[PDB]
């Protein structure tokens, strides 16, 4: 698996992401936390994002992957 | 596994937080969380409606407020 | 634990429902029956609606669950 | 559990009920249910097309079909 | 059970029958079925693309095919 | 059966690819890695693409899978 290492690096390094949903709209924030099903995305508020509605997670800058 | 969904929904429902629920097609639902189970969220306003979790993209509190407190009880 | 009693009360009490599909369409009618995967919605005909394509089930009047 | 879908679809198949099948993409298919299985419906018109249940939002028979 | 997809796809592959594959968002792909497994269809023309079955709404033969 | 070998050719041979998503967005890059659930796609950044949202994977040039010899 690669999802957890990928998301943990973005969180633990406070990397801003752009989260594109299956409907095409884009969320922006920092990955506060995540489990098997959801991502907690923070900015003004912290919102709970369902992984089944995420198409792609786009980091603002390259990250040194596992 | 699944750790964050229930406490996040639970505190919104316990403190009666107003929420915006965006569906996977763009429609915005607004109301208060009443109850939820593994597969649906019941949301109150004009009536209480059953929202399928598989149709939800994101649940947005109208005001911040969980995964950060050092204590669970 | 919640969706079966919810859909059971609607059907037994003849509560008209608005069913919103993920394709934007709003279906209207009454809940004739339901199983794990479908809801049969009574109108001029009975149609079979897949739960996977349902976003929300909106009662025409409040449902009271024990 | 899974109790109504197959009896419903089988009446449409056995009795050649004209149906309208509305997809998740909004598209409305019309024709006759030639056959089906756990995952797909075969729909007959000019050709027989294979329709994925996961893409179906609703199956609307053109005539009242009343289950027990 | 799972008993109709593979024979339907297999005869389209065998006979090089062109198909229109409408995706769940309504996009129409066109080509011939190169191969397929439990999860994807390999659709050949310009190049060979891997189409996810979860993203397919319908597979329409360009002409009737004796099932 | 097909999907892992197909993506592997793309990854190992560094084939430029377009990944179309169910929203219609077309992503362009090269496959750095992938598992059962996600594709990591590289260009200016490496982004994590969920397979459940992929509609079609379109290589920039022909890609063939070897027939199994009996």
């Amino acid at each position: 698996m690669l999802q957890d290492p990928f998301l943990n690096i973005l969180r633990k390094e406070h990397v801003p992401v752009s989260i594109y949903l299956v409907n095409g709209i884009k969320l922006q924030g920092q990955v506060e936390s995540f489990d098997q099903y959801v991502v907690l995305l923070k900015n003004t508020v912290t919102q709970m994002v369902y992984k089944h509605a995420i198409s792609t997670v786009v980091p603002a800058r390259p990250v040194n992957l596992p």
Side-chain angles (χ1 to χ4, degrees), chain A residues 6 9-18 57-65:
Chain A
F6 190 85
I9 267 70
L10 302 168
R11 169 224 285 139
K12 273 196 193 149
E13 309 200 0
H14 297 338
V15 195
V17 304
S18 289
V57 193
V58 179
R61 59 126 175 117
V63 296
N64 264 2
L65 280 143

Coordinates of all heavy atoms in Angstrom, one line a residue, chain A residues 6 9-18 57-65:
Chain A
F6 N 1.9 8.1 1.5 CA 1.7 9.3 0.8 C 1.0 10.4 1.6 O 1.4 11.6 1.6 CB 0.9 9.1 -0.5 CG 0.9 10.2 -1.5 CD1 1.9 10.4 -2.4 CD2 -0.1 11.1 -1.5 CE1 1.9 11.4 -3.3 CE2 -0.1 12.2 -2.4 CZ 0.9 12.3 -3.2
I9 N 3.1 11.7 4.8 CA 4.2 12.7 4.4 C 3.6 14.0 4.2 O 4.2 15.1 4.7 CB 5.0 12.2 3.2 CG1 6.2 11.3 3.7 CG2 5.5 13.3 2.4 CD1 5.9 10.0 4.3
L10 N 2.5 14.1 3.6 CA 1.8 15.4 3.4 C 1.4 16.1 4.7 O 1.5 17.3 4.9 CB 0.7 15.3 2.4 CG 1.0 14.7 1.1 CD1 -0.2 14.3 0.3 CD2 1.8 15.8 0.3
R11 N 0.9 15.3 5.6 CA 0.5 15.8 6.9 C 1.7 16.2 7.6 O 2.0 17.4 7.8 CB -0.3 14.8 7.7 CG -0.5 15.2 9.1 CD -0.2 14.1 10.1 NE -1.4 13.2 10.0 CZ -1.3 11.9 10.0 NH1 -0.1 11.2 10.1 NH2 -2.4 11.1 10.0
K12 N 2.6 15.2 8.0 CA 3.7 15.4 8.8 C 4.7 16.4 8.3 O 5.5 16.9 9.1 CB 4.5 14.0 9.0 CG 3.9 13.3 10.2 CD 4.8 12.1 10.7 CE 4.0 11.2 11.7 NZ 4.4 9.8 11.6
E13 N 4.6 16.8 7.1 CA 5.4 18.0 6.6 C 4.6 19.2 6.2 O 5.1 20.1 5.6 CB 6.2 17.5 5.3 CG 7.0 16.3 5.5 CD 8.2 16.2 4.5 OE1 8.3 17.1 3.6 OE2 8.9 15.1 4.5
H14 N 3.3 19.2 6.7 CA 2.4 20.4 6.5 C 2.4 20.8 5.1 O 2.4 22.0 4.8 CB 2.9 21.5 7.5 CG 2.8 21.1 8.9 ND1 2.0 20.1 9.4 CD2 3.4 21.5 10.0 CE1 2.1 19.9 10.7 NE2 3.0 20.8 11.1
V15 N 2.3 19.9 4.1 CA 2.3 20.2 2.7 C 0.8 20.5 2.3 O 0.0 19.7 2.4 CB 2.8 19.1 1.9 CG1 3.2 19.5 0.5 CG2 4.0 18.4 2.6
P16 N 0.6 21.7 1.8 CA -0.8 22.0 1.2 C -1.1 21.1 0.0 O -0.2 20.9 -0.8 CB -0.7 23.5 0.8 CG 0.7 23.8 0.7 CD 1.4 22.9 1.7
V17 N -2.3 20.6 0.0 CA -2.7 19.7 -1.1 C -3.9 20.4 -1.8 O -4.6 21.3 -1.2 CB -3.2 18.3 -0.6 CG1 -2.0 17.6 0.1 CG2 -4.4 18.4 0.2
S18 N -4.2 20.0 -3.0 CA -5.4 20.3 -3.7 C -6.1 19.0 -4.0 O -5.5 18.1 -4.6 CB -5.1 21.0 -5.0 OG -4.7 22.3 -4.8
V57 N -5.2 13.5 -5.3 CA -4.6 14.4 -4.3 C -3.4 15.0 -4.9 O -2.4 14.2 -5.1 CB -4.4 13.7 -3.0 CG1 -4.0 14.7 -1.9 CG2 -5.6 12.8 -2.5
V58 N -3.3 16.3 -5.1 CA -2.3 17.0 -5.8 C -1.5 17.8 -4.7 O -2.0 18.9 -4.3 CB -2.8 17.9 -6.9 CG1 -1.7 18.6 -7.6 CG2 -3.6 17.0 -7.9
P59 N -0.3 17.4 -4.3 CA 0.5 18.2 -3.4 C 1.0 19.5 -4.1 O 1.2 19.6 -5.3 CB 1.7 17.3 -3.1 CG 1.3 16.0 -3.6 CD 0.4 16.2 -4.7
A60 N 1.1 20.6 -3.3 CA 1.6 21.9 -3.8 C 3.0 21.8 -4.3 O 3.3 22.6 -5.2 CB 1.4 22.9 -2.8
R61 N 3.8 21.0 -3.8 CA 5.2 20.8 -4.2 C 5.6 19.4 -4.2 O 4.8 18.6 -3.6 CB 6.1 21.6 -3.2 CG 6.1 21.2 -1.7 CD 7.5 20.8 -1.2 NE 7.5 20.5 0.2 CZ 7.8 19.3 0.7 NH1 8.2 18.3 -0.1 NH2 7.8 19.2 2.0
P62 N 6.6 19.0 -4.9 CA 7.0 17.6 -4.8 C 7.4 17.1 -3.4 O 7.9 17.9 -2.6 CB 8.2 17.5 -5.8 CG 8.0 18.6 -6.7 CD 7.4 19.7 -5.9
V63 N 7.1 15.9 -3.1 CA 7.5 15.3 -1.8 C 8.4 14.2 -2.0 O 8.3 13.5 -3.1 CB 6.3 14.9 -0.9 CG1 5.4 16.1 -0.6 CG2 5.5 13.8 -1.7
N64 N 9.4 14.0 -1.1 CA 10.3 12.9 -1.2 C 9.5 11.6 -0.8 O 9.3 11.4 0.4 CB 11.5 13.1 -0.4 CG 12.7 13.7 -1.2 OD1 12.6 13.9 -2.4 ND2 13.8 13.9 -0.6
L65 N 9.2 10.8 -1.7 CA 8.3 9.6 -1.5 C 9.1 8.5 -0.9 O 10.3 8.4 -1.1 CB 7.7 9.2 -2.8 CG 6.4 10.0 -3.2 CD1 6.4 10.2 -4.7 CD2 5.2 9.3 -2.8

